[PDB]
């Protein structure tokens, strides 16, 4: 509704996007308290994923009476127990599920996605091709164009752009790589207000941001066993963190059903964003995400060498 | 259909958009031979429209056995017969249907749409408001921005832009009026090749162009009785003329499900276009079309005085 959209825009610059208390439904999330060893939150769709690891779970309510050792891999639990630095995700795979868990304050946060084993030399070949091509770039402009062409080759997204920020955080589209029959966004300007400060902040917590489907219903976090601290839990280090309905609408209005964005960092400063938009919904596996982030990180070093 | 898309792009500048031998499905079309008063062409969906005029019609095969006096209002036929000028459309309404027919070459062409009687002063109020506001404009910039705001208020479309052509027919977006959560298209350039010559030509035959749903399937014109001339019939004087699948795909990739464009003319030269895009499909009645075209016509006259 128009008035609800207006009210969202009223408080949008201050919206707490790190604590949506909901997730995107392409995975499930558990939140466990470190000291009480108890599940304190579960995403609404937790049943349809964790039934694969423990066949005794049928509804969301069964999780309260479920045992963590039945839901998570033994390796993931022991890795969370001995990991001492905060917000460093541990990635553990089984035959059917793909877990990503980290330690944040007094909690363990576990995301899980479905996973399909893919055995091929394709990633090693793509990695070598990407690096040699980026090493050959000797001019600033040639590098960003090669990077945008490579990101498109790897992910298959319909349009891939690079935003560069100016000192005052306004964005300009400095290079583009798009399929035919698309409006050219090259040299488009957008104001700093379009990306709130806290939205830029997330790229320093997790350098990739993933929206596989702008029209999937966000799943909220249900309380399971009562926590000692009831403040909402920061979800920013993982990938399932739900998207602001505002931005989902913005993406719809542009004809975009799926997006993936990657931060470009010069030292610790955020210099720009690599953004990928797709007209149809689109899922990218964890390995493809890694390949994109590694390619962008390699490109950044060469870029600073060139300037 | 990527490969087929590429082959269509190959021949796009040469594509004959005036003779698509198909129509958009928000109406039905008959093409009748002038001398024999015989239906030589009918759009495939004619049944669901003319069933309202003769309920003994259920499907297209009934039209082959039909006589036009059974399908059309008698005054419309006598008006087409007695008219002496070509391509000047006659507009005839019944309680349930709205016909637009004209005289073209060897035939009488008739479009028919569904129609619902709506009784209110809304149109007179909008008309008065538009004229008084457009009369207050004292500068070129004031006029284009007021016009874009007014066209948006009248049609309710999500985005309304004004393209201005330069001497070599490249387009620049000089003014825009768009809802919140939309990428600003202000000052966007597009090359002359993006609007082929035959498409600009159409605005001189009919100043409004209407696409109420980019995802509706074009309905082809079927031969009924063999005509004396087998050359394709120019459909450009009406509004049902089917849209190039190329442009429909272009609009999808831009997030547009419905579009309406209106030509801005300085004497008979085409000076620009007023374009309306909507994220979801949208239908505009014949009265709304007349109001949009008259408002643009009034704005243009004020513009030439202003410069
Ligand atoms: C007041 C708050 C607003 C807001 C919030 C918001 N935006 C993002 C992410 C965006 N939004 C971008 C906007 C654009 N402007 C343009 O001109 C174009 C052109 C293609 C775009 C895309 C933008 C560039 C980003 C970052 C990268 C991206 O392209 O996705 C977020 C983050 C969403 C999240 O939770 O991940 C928020 C909260 N957007 C506004 O426009 C104003 C209203
Ligand atoms: C080689 C032929 C091509 C083609 C054909 C084509 N275009 C139109 C109508 C258009 N197309 C427009 C394209 C744009 N360029 C931009 O930068 C933007 C930005 C928003 C747009 C929309 C355009 C402005 C018009 C006229 C206005 C409108 O919105 O309709 C047609 C006519 C369609 C019809 O009614 O039959 C045709 C045939 N489009 C191409 O992109 C190239 C491939
Ligand atoms: Cl990940
Ligand atoms: Cl009409």
Residue numbers in the entry:
A (entry chain C), B (entry chain A): 6 to 312
Pull verbatim passages from the article behind this deposition:
Recently, studies focusing on the naturally-occurring phytochrome-activated diguanylyl cyclase from the bacterium Idiomarina sp. A28L (IsPadC) have suggested that asymmetric structural rearrangements within the phytochrome dimer eventually regulate OM activity (in this case the OM is a diguanylyl cyclase (DGC)). The PSMs of Bphs are bi-stable photoswitches, which reversibly convert between red-absorbing (Pr) and far-red–absorbing (Pfr) parent states, thereby capable of regulating the dynamic range of a variety of OMs. This transition between the PSM states involves a Z/E isomerization of the BV chromophore, as well as large-scale changes of the protein backbone. Therefore, we generated the PAS–GAF truncation (IsPadCPG, residues 1–312) to address the effect of the core chromophore-binding interface on dimer photoactivation.
